Amino acid sequence: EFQQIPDFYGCYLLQSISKRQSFYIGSTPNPVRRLRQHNGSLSRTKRDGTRPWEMVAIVYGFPSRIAALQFQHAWQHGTRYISIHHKLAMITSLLKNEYFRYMDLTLHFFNQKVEEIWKNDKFNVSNYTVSLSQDALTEINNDTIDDIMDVNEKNMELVQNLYSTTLAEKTKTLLLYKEKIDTGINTCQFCNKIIKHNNISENLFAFCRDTSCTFVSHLACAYRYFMSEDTIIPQSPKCPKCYTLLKWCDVIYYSIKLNK
């Protein structure tokens, strides 16, 4: 029995709003709930102003909880895979590493000033994706209680938006692929047999990330085609029809979840 790739699993960086040299790194399948636990309590600690935290960045797209924890622990250790400047440089170092490169992760910033420091790449550490929230926060004002609260509330809304949207997009895309399978008249791009659930090799399918592209195949067939120092996992294969770049991790995400 295969385990599904998580709908969402991310490794996040928190920066205290008031204590701006305090950071925290963790990993989670639900960053909204997690940020409430960090800012309030774990379940229903004297306060020294470390809370509330701002979630300033999150790396997500991990193929498993295990992989996210590997990234988290490497990021915290600072690791065999190799100030705010150092925390952000560690992200780039890990995204360049052979192991995490296969995952085509997404680095998302909720704060534009933090994104700018990362981009400035002070240490010249420079397939992963980088994104920045619409209405990302910029310079933080922590001079008053109301300013601190305003930052916390706006940051929560940004984290909610990214998370709920990511889940809604995967939901929508799963439904569209399922409809393709359900028609039972698609055929495999490579072996030409009808696409139908009937043998893991026969029931795992691969789709183009463009839902209006008609490329569909057996996962095994796509794997074979893409794979023709030696490697095992495809890296940035292109759709044989529209030539767009695919993320193998996303291909597997939908493949396994449709079968389950």
Partner 1 sequence: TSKSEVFEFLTHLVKQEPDLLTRIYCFQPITMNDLINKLRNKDSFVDLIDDGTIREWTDKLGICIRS
Which residues sit at the interface with partner 1, rule CB under 8 A? 2-3, 5, 63-64, 66-67, 70, 80-81, 97-99, 101-103, 200-201, 204, 220, 223, 229-234, 248-249, 252, 255-256
CB of 24 to Zn ion, least distance (A): 40
Per partner kind, with CB cut-offs from 5 to 8 A, the member of Zn ion, partner 1, Cl ion, none near residue 50 is Cl ion
Asked whether position 20 contacts Cl ion by CB under 5 A, the answer is: no
For residue 54, what are its two tokens? 């701002």
> Both tokens of residue 143?
């001079």
| CA pair distance 156, 147, nearest whole angstrom | 14
Please pick, from the candidates 50, 92, 211, 259, the single residue that binds Cl ion as defined by CB under 5 A.
Answer: 50
Query: Which DSSP helix (H) or strand (E) runs through 207?
Result: strand 205-207
Q: The tokens of 186 are what? A: 């698609």
Q: Are strands 106-111 and 53-60 parallel, antiparallel or unpaired?
A: antiparallel
CB 155 within 8 A of CB 108: no
Shortest distance, position 199 Cβ to Zn ion, whole Å: 12
**Which of the 8 DSSP states describes residue 131?**
E
How far apart are CB 2 and partner 1 at their closest, in Å? Answer: 6
Annotate 8-68 with DSSP letters as a single string: --EEEEEEESSSTT-EEEEEES-HHHHHHHHHS-S------S-PSEEEEEEEE--SSHHHH
Least Å from the CB of residue 37 to Cl ion: 10
Going by C-alpha positions, the residue among 136, 160, 138 that lies closest to residue 34 is: 160
- Binding test (CB under 5 A) with Zn ion, winner from 188, 195, 206, 219: 188
- For position 215 contacting Zn ion by CB under 5 A, the verdict is yes
State which of positions 72-131 bind Zn ion (CB under 5 A): none
> Which option in Cl ion, partner 1, Zn ion, none does residue 105 bind, with CB closer than 5 to 8 A by kind?
none
Q: Is residue 34 within the footprint of Cl ion (CB under 5 A)?
A: no
Q: How far does Cα 230 stand from its chain's mean position?
A: 27
Residue type (1 letter), 191? C
Smallest gap, in angstroms, from Cβ of residue 92 to partner 1?
18
Q: Helix crossing, 31-39 with 145-183: angle to 10°? A: 160
191 contacts Zn ion (rule: CB under 5 A): yes
Say how many C-beta atoms besides its own lie within 10 A of residue 13's C-beta.
25
The answer to whether 37 contacts Cl ion (rule: CB under 5 A) is: no
Using rule CB under 5 A, residue 194 touches Zn ion: no
Binder of Zn ion out of 34, 87, 218, 247 (CB under 5 A): 218
The amino acid occupying position 237 is: P
In this complex, which beta carbon is closest to partner 1, that of residue 208 or of residue 219?
219
Residue 33 as a binder of Cl ion (CB under 5 A): the answer is yes
Do 96 and 74 touch, CB atoms closer than 8 A?
Answer: no
Give the nearer residue to partner 1 in terms of CB position, either 187 or 201: 201
The residues binding Zn ion (CB under 5 A) are 188, 191, 208, 210, 213, 215, 218, 221, 239, 241-242
List residues binding Cl ion (CB under 5 A).
32-33, 47-48, 50-51
